[PDB]
């Protein structure tokens, strides 16, 4: 659980993300694929992208990043009260895409990296701490939903 001031730091930087959801979405996916290339194997229509520039020119990738960040934002705004919003992600992660929690740690690292690269002035230690706790809670609660659906990833 996060304190009310921790949630405000999370939503404060998140408001900055929403000034450019598409570009943040692209930088996060690209950072994920580069840091942890195994993750790119989950995306059938994205593994023909061989270069950073090709990934940025792909409209489908950009659209996907907005879909990912929109869902994540809607969860964060619930400040922990996110069972209704989380359940559909658990279901497709556990029953369709098979996305292990380690891969959610990978994209969590990418999110922190890009937030610090773009917003250092609104993402110092305390805000990094708060966002870390929020994503930790996200992963903890999706793991528990994964197991209720019979996925141990
Ligand atoms: C912050 C964490 C994440 C969020 C909020 C998120 C959200 C979403 C949403 C909203 C969709 C479309 C709906 C559905 O299928 O559920 C999607 C699809 C997808 N996700 Fe995730 N995702 C996350 C992390 C990941 C990671 C870490 C992987 C892989 C390494 C992944 C792989 C996929 C794939 C393969 C699809 C299907 C895409 C298609 O080809 O149209 N996701 N995700």
């Amino acid at each position: 659980v996060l304190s009310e001031g921790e949630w405000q730091l999370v939503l404060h930087v998140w408001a900055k993300v929403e000034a450019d959801v598409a570009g943040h979405g692209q930088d996060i996916l690209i950072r994920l694929f580069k840091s942890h290339p195994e993750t790119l194997e989950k995306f059938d229509r994205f593994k023909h992208l061989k270069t950073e520039a090709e990934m940025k020119a792909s409209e489908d990738l950009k659209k996907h990043g907005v879909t990912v960040l929109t869902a994540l934002g809607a969860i964060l705004k619930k400040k922990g009260h996110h069972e209704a919003e989380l359940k559909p992600l658990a279901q497709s992660g556990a029953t369709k895409h098979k996305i292990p929690i380690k891969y959610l740690e990978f994209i969590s690292e990418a999110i922190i990296h890009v937030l610090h690269s773009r917003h250092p002035g609104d993402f110092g230690a305390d805000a990094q701490g708060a966002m870390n706790k929020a994503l930790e809670l996200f992963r903890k609660d999706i793991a528990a939903k994964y197991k209720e659906l019979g996925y141990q990833g």
Side-chain angles (χ1 to χ4, degrees), residues 1-101 103-153:
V1 88
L2 280 62
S3 72
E4 169 69 18
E6 274 157 354
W7 286 118
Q8 288 178 22
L9 292 169
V10 169
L11 300 181
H12 171 81
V13 71
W14 196 257
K16 304 295 195 185
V17 173
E18 295 185 334
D20 183 15
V21 181
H24 287 77
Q26 293 171 304
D27 289 355
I28 288 166
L29 293 169
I30 287 158
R31 175 61 175 203
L32 172 67
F33 294 149
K34 175 193 139 189
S35 304
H36 303 287
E38 66 266 44
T39 63
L40 180 57
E41 292 172 356
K42 293 288 185 172
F43 295 93
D44 296 309
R45 298 179 324 267
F46 295 161
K47 40 203 210 180
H48 62 144
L49 307 172
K50 301 303 187 33
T51 67
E52 174 167 313
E54 275 178 340
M55 285 185 168
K56 292 198 164 145
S58 160
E59 196 172 353
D60 266 57
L61 186 153
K62 175 171 68 168
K63 290 196 278 190
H64 179 61
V66 167
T67 292
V68 169
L69 291 187
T70 296
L72 179 52
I75 290 157
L76 292 173
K77 292 179 189 177
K78 302 308 169 285
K79 305 160 71 188
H81 303 75
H82 52 216
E83 169 187 307
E85 290 77 20
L86 197 51
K87 257 210 190 152
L89 284 185
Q91 183 98 191
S92 71
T95 68
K96 210 203 174 142
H97 314 309
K98 310 289 183 170
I99 307 311
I101 304 299
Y103 283 12
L104 303 181
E105 301 177 315
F106 294 163
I107 194 170
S108 287
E109 292 154 21
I111 290 160
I112 293 163
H113 179 79
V114 169
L115 291 186
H116 190 260
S117 292
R118 294 213 182 199
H119 311 288
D122 294 281
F123 208 53
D126 289 347
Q128 294 163 215
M131 181 64 76
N132 247 84
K133 288 193 194 171
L135 300 176
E136 278 165 6
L137 174 63
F138 168 66
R139 294 190 310 265
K140 170 180 148 44
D141 288 354
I142 202 161
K145 297 275 187 270
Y146 271 3
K147 290 177 173 78
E148 296 180 329
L149 300 171
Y151 178 59
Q152 299 297 315

